[PDB]
Design a protein around this ligand. Structure first.
Ligand SMILES: *[P@@](=O)(CCCCCCCC)OC[C@@H](COC(=O)NCCCCCCCC)OC(=O)NCCCCCCCC
Ligand SMILES: [Ca+2]
Length: 285
């Protein structure tokens, strides 16, 4: 069909400790295939696993400029998951002429309580040195298995961009589509760029999924019934037009992980992306 055929190409931007494809396994499990099936031009980008939103954004910018100046398409439709959120926002804020839309999926725009929890580790301590060194090792491994290089790994920069303080510093510099209120919506269209967002509210969805143990445990860093996906709060995930911030999905189900094991009492995450590509096509993007 033509159901997902957008005028401008769909560009997928991964989150922290993310990748494009590792030996056949997609980060966006069954999403590029399902989008391409009904007409969408999909480009899966690879950005630095662990670094600041600005560095990651600058890398994505170069790739977006390469996609525009090669495919002969003026603008592109950006879709970012988790850290992919503030990363696509950098690109949309500095170069709005090249972006038709910026959609965030489970993105901690106003911070992650899990990242805020990690601030308990004293700066410059032994614990910081070993936590950063270890996460840097994991990012280095993900980069090698995906691209063939260690890359430059800066987990302290990821965590700073993902905590409430650093996210607020980033939001001050690039305010486009960010809600002025704590949990409302942001401006739908700023500088020719349409802003959208969605997320999930259920840390536990499928007991067969190994990641549900991690996401359920990490959800406990969110106190006072703050609705979250295990790592990101619903209110924090708001950007522009909120489709739904309450899907029965955890942080990984948002990208149809692990291996498509999601809630059966909810519609497929794949279908959400397909409906979104259609919404963008109907918005003449
Ligand atoms: P987002 O960018 C930012 C969310 C808020 C951040 C919390 C700061 C916490 C450090 O999220 C996208 C990421 C989620 O990654 C994680 O926090 N998970 C770390 C689990 C790791 C550690 C223990 C193993 C130790 C050796 O989504 C992903 O990184 N990617 C998924 C892997 C998918 C492949 C699945 C198949 C696995 C066989
Ligand atoms: Ca899952």
């Amino acid at each position: 069909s033509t159901y997902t055929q957008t005028k401008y190409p769909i560009v997928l931007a991964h989150g922290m400790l993310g990748f494009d494809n590792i030996l056949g396994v997609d980060y966006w499990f069954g999403i590029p295939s399902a989008l391409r099936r009904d007409g969408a031009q999909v480009y899966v980008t690879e950005v630095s696993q662990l670094d600041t939103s600005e560095v990651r954004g600058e890398q994505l910018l170069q790739q977006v400029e390469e996609i525009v100046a090669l495919s002969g398409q003026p603008k592109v439709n950006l879709i970012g998951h988790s850290h992919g959120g503030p990363t696509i926002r950098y690109v949309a804020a500095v170069r709005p002429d090249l972006i038709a839309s910026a959609t965030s999926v489970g993105a901690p725009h106003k911070g992650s309580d899990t990242a805020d929890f990690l601030r308990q580790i004293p700066p410059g301590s032994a614990g910081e040195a070993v936590l950063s060194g270890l996460v840097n090792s994991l990012g280095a491994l993900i980069s090698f298995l995906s691209s063939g290089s260690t890359g430059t790994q800066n987990s302290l920069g990821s965590l700073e961009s993902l905590n409430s303080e650093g996210a607020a510093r980033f939001n001050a510099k690039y305010p486009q589509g960010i809600p002025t209120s704590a949990c409302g919506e942001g401006a739908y269209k700023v500088n020719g760029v349409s802003y959208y967002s969605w997320s999930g509210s259920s840390p536990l969805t499928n007991f067969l999924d190994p990641s549900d143990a991690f996401l359920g445990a990490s959800s406990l860093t969110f106190k006072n019934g703050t609705a979250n996906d295990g790592l990101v709060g619903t209110c924090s995930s708001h950007l522009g037009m909120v489709i739904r911030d309450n899907y029965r999905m955890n942080h990984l189900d948002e990208v149809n992980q692990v291996f498509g094991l999601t809630s059966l009492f909810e519609t497929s995450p794949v279908s959400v992306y397909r409906q979104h590509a259609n919404r963008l096509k109907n918005a003449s993007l």
